[PDB]
C-alpha cells in the first residue's frame, strides 16, 4: 500500500553532465535523513530509443519516492529537512512536480 | 549490474480505463514466463504534474537481455503489448554512482 511518486528530471542550465550526476548522487545521499520518506531512487537516462512513439521532451534523470502511508507523507510534507532537500532538488537536479502512481491490481 | 528499461505508456484511442488496467495486469501476469526478463512492474498514473502507466523491465545482464530479445515468447508478450499500448516512450536508465 506504498505511496509512490515519480519525477522526470531535466538538467539545470549552466552545469555540466558531470556536475549533474554528482548533484543526483548527493541528492540520493541526503534522502536517507528525510523524515517520512521510506525510500528514494535516482537514475540517469542513459538512452532514449513497434508501438507508436510517444513525443515528450528530453529527460536527463528519473527520481522516485516511496512513502509507507498517508501519515508518513504528512510528516514528510511538514518537515524542514524535507524542505531543504527539495530546495536542493529543485535548484540542482531540476525537480518539478511528480507523477503519482498506483498498482494495477485491485 | 542489472539492466533497467522504463516505459511511459499511453492507452489506445477509445479504450476504457477499466480495460486498460485489466490489460496491464494481464501483461504483468504474462511477464513471469518471459525468458531473460528478471522482473517486470507496471503501475497506473493516478495523478500527473498524458501518460496512463509506467512500465519497467529488469534484466540481470547483457546475456539475459540477449536471451529475451531472441525469444519467441517475448515476441508474443510484445504482441500482447500492442493490444493495450497506443504509444510508448522507452528509456534505458543507469545508476548515478
Ligand atoms: Cl524535520
From Swiss-Prot, chain B:
pH dependence, entry free text: Optimum pH is 6.5-7.
Annotated SUPFAM superfamilies: Dimeric alpha+beta barrel
EC code: 5.4.99.14
Lineage: superkingdom: Bacteria
The keyword Isomerase appears for this protein: yes
Catalytic reaction(s) noted: 4-methylmuconolactone = 3-methylmuconolactone
Active-site residues per Swiss-Prot or TrEMBL entry: 27
UniProt keywords, alphabetically: Isomerase
Binding of 3-methylmuconolactone, residues: 27, 40
Keyword Isomerase: yes
Gene Ontology molecular function terms on file: isomerase activity
Description of how activity is regulated: Inhibited by CuSO(4), N-ethylmaleimide and p-chloromercuribenzoate.
Chain positions recorded as 4-methylmuconolactone binding sites: 27, 40
Pfam families tied to this protein: MmlI
Subunit structure, interactors included: Homodimer or homotetramer.
Family under the similarity heading: Belongs to the MmlI family.
Biological role stated in the UniProt entry: Isomerase involved in the degradation of 4-methylcatechol. Catalyzes the isomerization of the dead-end metabolite 4-methylmuconolactone (4-ML) to 3-methylmuconolactone (3-ML), which can then be further degraded through a modified 3-oxoadipate pathway. Can also use 1-methylbislactone, but not the isomeric methyl-substituted 4-carboxymethylbut-2-en-4-olides.
Stated name of the protein: 4-carboxymethyl-4-methylbutenolide mutase
Protein's organism: Cupriavidus pinatubonensis (strain JMP 134 / LMG 1197)
Underlying gene: mmlI
Amino acid at each position: 500500500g506504498m505511496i509512490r511518486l515519480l519525477y522526470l528530471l531535466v538538467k539545470p542550465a549552466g552545469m555540466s553532465d558531470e556536475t549533474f550526476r554528482a548533484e543526483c548522487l548527493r541528492h540520493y545521499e541526503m534522502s536517507h535523513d528525510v523524515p517520512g520518506l521510506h525510500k528514494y531512487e535516482v537514475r540517469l537516462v542513459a538512452e532514449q530509443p513497434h508501438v507508436p512513439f510517444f513525443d515528450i521532451g528530453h529527460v536527463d534523470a528519473i527520481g522516485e519516492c516511496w512513502f509507507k502511508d498517508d501519515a508518513a507523507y504528512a510528516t514528510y510534507m511538514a518537515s524542514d529537512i524535507r524542505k531543504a532537500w527539495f530546495e536542493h532538488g529543485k535548484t540542482f537536479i531540476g525537480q518539478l512536480k511528480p507523477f503519482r502512481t498506483a498498482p494495477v491490481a485491485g
